[PDB]
Amino acid sequence: KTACPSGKKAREIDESLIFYKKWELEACVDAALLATQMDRVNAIPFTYEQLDVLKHKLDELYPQGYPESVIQHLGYLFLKMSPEDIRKWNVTSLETLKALLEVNKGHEMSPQVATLIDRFVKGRGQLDKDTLDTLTAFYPGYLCSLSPEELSSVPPSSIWAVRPQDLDTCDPRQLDVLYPKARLAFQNMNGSEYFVKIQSFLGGAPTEDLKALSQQNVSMDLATFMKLRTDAVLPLTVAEVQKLL
Ligand SMILES: *[C@@H]1O[C@H](CO)[C@@H](O)[C@H](O)[C@H]1NC(C)=O
């Protein structure tokens, strides 16, 4: 059954291929043709095994990792992707990254997705704001999942993207690294514009900065009061504490 049956030699990727058997797709469908017209696959209602064949073709064609040409239109092939394979990928455009993450909506960060992001960010060089926006959209609890030392490398610019709900899972050792960045990030912003944004990062704020906030008529919430460093609220006086209330 090596040869493709006469007449079934597919010149184009189309809906006819759903009728084909596993070996027929392995015989008839050329890999080079599939790679070019990979944008059609998500349209065609293929079966489980049929996709495995299409996936196998790409490995044969691209032993050294797929190009971004193909990656963009992977779709539900991404689900059947090996972790080592993704390490080869050189993804750059964020529109690529969105499409991949949109196949695993709702679910937890799969091994594949985890390996994709680490490779993505290495390629960029730094964790961008635009990067964070997309990551936090699909996976809110990302920043807290990063190890404290990795957060040190994170530029102050990216803190714009972070939201109050994103830091819920963060332990205080992470907030100690994020606070000075947030402080550098939200600079030149006088008044309540300072306060409203820093609310969250106060969880890792020294005592010297708490005395500064007291005298600027902030009127801090009492919910925020509770989420402060126990060690770094000892030098601060009750007089100073009263000015935050
Ligand atoms: C990624 O880029 C490196 C350096 O240009 C190259 O050696 C490698 O083959 C690329 N990986 C891909 C796109 O398969």
Residue owning the nearest CA to atom 9 of ligand 1: 64
Closest ligand 1 atom to Cα of 67: 13
Q: Which two tokens stand for residue 81?
A: 């992707």
Q: Which two tokens stand for residue 183?
A: 């402080």
Find how far residue 157's CA is from the centre of its chain: 17
Resolution (A): 3.6
Half-sphere exposure of 32 (CA within 13 A, CB side): 1
Dihedral sign for Cα atoms in the order 36, 42, 44, 49: positive
DSSP symbols for the chain? --SPPTT---SS-SGGGGSS-HHHHHHHS-HHHHHHTGGGTTTS---HHHHHHHHHHHHHH-TT---HHHHTT-GGGGGG--HHHHTT-----HHHHHHHHTSS-SS---HHHHHHHHHHHHHHSS--HHHHHHHHHH-STTTTTS-HHHHHSS-GGGGGT--GGGGSS--HHHHHHHHHHHHHHT-S--THHHHHHHGGGGGG--HHHHHHHHTTT----HHHHHSS-SGGGSSS-HHHHHHH-
If you search the block for the tokens 């679910």, which residue do you land on? 107
Q: Which two tokens stand for residue 151?
A: 């957060």
Q: How many CB atoms lie within 10 A of CB 116?
A: 24
Ligand 1 pocket: which of 70, 89, 90 to mutate (most atoms within 8 A of CB): 90
Residue owning the nearest CA to atom 2 of ligand 1: 90
For residues 38 and 45, the answer to whether their CB atoms sit within 8 Å is: no
- State how far the Cα of 173 lies from the Cα of 171, in Å rounded to an integer: 6
Q: How many CB atoms lie within 10 A of CB 38?
A: 21
Half-sphere exposure of 147 (CA within 13 A, CB side): 3
- State how far the Cα of 233 lies from the Cα of 80, in Å rounded to an integer: 51
CA 211 to ligand 1 centroid distance, Å: 52
List b or e across 149-186, with b for residues whose CB sees 16 or more CB atoms inside 10 angstroms: eebeebeeebbebbeeebbeebeeebbbbbbbbbbebb
Q: Which two tokens stand for residue 242?
A: 């009263």
Closest ligand 1 atom to Cα of 66: 14
Cβ-Cβ contacts under 8 Å for 178 (sequence gap 6 or more): 143, 151, 159, 162, 167, 170, 201, 204
User: Would you say the CB of residue 87 lies under 6 angstroms from ligand 1?
Assistant: no
CA 65 to ligand 1 centroid distance, Å: 8
User: Would you say the CB of residue 63 lies under 6 angstroms from ligand 1?
Assistant: no
CA 88 to ligand 1 centroid distance, Å: 7
Q: Which two tokens stand for residue 114?
A: 């985890």
CA 68 to ligand 1 centroid distance, Å: 11
CA 99 to ligand 1 centroid distance, Å: 21
Closest ligand 1 atom to Cα of 62: 14
Give the CA radius of gyration of the chain. 26
CA 43 to ligand 1 centroid distance, Å: 29
User: Would you say the CB of residue 75 lies under 6 angstroms from ligand 1?
Assistant: no
- State how far the Cα of 14 lies from the Cα of 23, in Å rounded to an integer: 17
Phi then psi dihedrals of residue 221, to 5 deg: -75, 150
Nearest to 48 by CA among 25, 71, 69: 25
Q: Which two tokens stand for residue 14?
A: 């189309």
Breaks in the chain at C–N > 2.5 Å: after which residues?
none
Find how far residue 51's CA is from the centre of its chain: 26
- State how far the Cα of 59 lies from the Cα of 73, in Å rounded to an integer: 15
Closest ligand 1 atom to Cα of 64: 14
- State how far the Cα of 204 lies from the Cα of 201, in Å rounded to an integer: 6
Nearest to 132 by CA among 111, 174, 105, 161: 161
User: Would you say the CB of residue 65 lies under 6 angstroms from ligand 1?
Assistant: yes
User: Would you say the CB of residue 6 lies under 6 angstroms from ligand 1?
Assistant: no
Closest ligand 1 atom to Cα of 65: 14
If you search the block for the tokens 């960029």, which residue do you land on? 124
CA 34 to each of CA 8, 17, 53, 71, 158: distance values in angstroms, whole numbers, following the listed order: 15, 12, 11, 12, 38
For residues 58 and 51, the answer to whether their CB atoms sit within 8 Å is: no
